[PDB]
């Protein structure tokens, strides 16, 4: 997204789109972790300050897509949700802490070249890879430019956009905002004098922040798109939910429901 690049087909087989039934519109991005489970940001389904609240059948899950807008028949798969599980300690009130939700699909999606799950991190992987400087990738169908007012920038893209972002050191992250950071969220982006740039933007919430294990070649979802101040602004970074930190909860829901 923002300062992104068109994705290749099947580059993110776990990417999931969150689609509203009526009106039909893109709500957020998500991710397939198994055949019956999708991971997204909690604020994608619940946000009291903006009266945002969607129940099970207020939305659909579109898996296997590349085109933002078209109905890719014989490629994408649309699922219906059996149940929505939001983190019980999710803080919509002050800092979006523990911004994570889980969704149980009525029926398990089938895997193809376009649909395949991503891995969740484990101690050794979270440990080795989540070090500042390391680059992760964030994909989405969101705005190519900041929404903030009446402004130009190639609206939304027709295809899914990928941008490889670098991980930023904590003191830097917390000095970049007035919101209260928490160990359950990291921040990624290029600093002013680095030259390069890119950021998730509106429409990418819930999207995966992935990393590639050079120790086994597997892609791991290190984060989820949560919040940001503007998009691709200088001196600002995007904040992502810390999956590993929440992996214990993710396991409880799945090993019970």
């Amino acid at each position: 997204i923002v300062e992104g690049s068109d994705a290749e087909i099947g580059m993110s087989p776990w990417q999931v789109m969150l689609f509203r039934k009526s009106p039909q519109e893109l709500l957020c991005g998500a991710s397939l972790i198994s055949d019956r489970w999708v991971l997204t940001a909690a604020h994608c389904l619940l946000y009291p300050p903006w009266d945002k609240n969607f129940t099970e059948n207020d939305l659909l899950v579109r898996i296997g897509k590349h085109s933002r807008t078209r109905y890719e028949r014989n490629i994408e798969k649309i699922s219906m949700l059996e149940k929505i599980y939001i983190h019980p300690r999710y803080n919509w009130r002050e800092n979006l802490d523990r911004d994570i939700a889980l969704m149980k699909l009525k029926k398990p999606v089938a895997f193809s070249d376009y649909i395949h799950p991503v891995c969740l991190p484990d101690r050794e992987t979270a440990a080795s890879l989540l070090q500042a400087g390391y680059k992760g990738r964030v994909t989405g169908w969101g705005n190519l430019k900041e929404t903030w007012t009446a402004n130009v920038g190639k609206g939304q893209p027709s295809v899914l956009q990928v941008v490889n972002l670098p991980i930023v050191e904590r003191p830097v992250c917390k000095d970049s905002t007035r919101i209260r950071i928490t160990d359950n969220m990291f921040c990624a982006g290029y600093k002013p004098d680095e030259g390069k740039r890119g950021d998730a933007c509106e429409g990418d919430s819930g999207g995966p922040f992935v990393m590639k294990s050079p120790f086994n070649n597997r892609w791991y979802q290190m984060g989820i798109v949560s919040w940001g101040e503007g998009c691709d602004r200088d001196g600002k970074y995007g904040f992502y939910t810390h999956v590993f930190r929440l992996k214990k909860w993710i396991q409880k829901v799945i090993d019970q429901f």
Binding site: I9, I33, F111
Partner: peptide, 26 residues
């Protein structure tokens, strides 16, 4: 198949247009 191994790339031994940017950053 098992998570994180993409059918059109890893299972085919083909890298994407920028994954090298990542592995290179480590």
């Amino acid at each position: 198949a098992d998570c994180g191994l993409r059918p059109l790339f890893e299972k085919k031994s083909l890298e994407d247009k920028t994954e090298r940017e990542l592995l290179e950053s480590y």
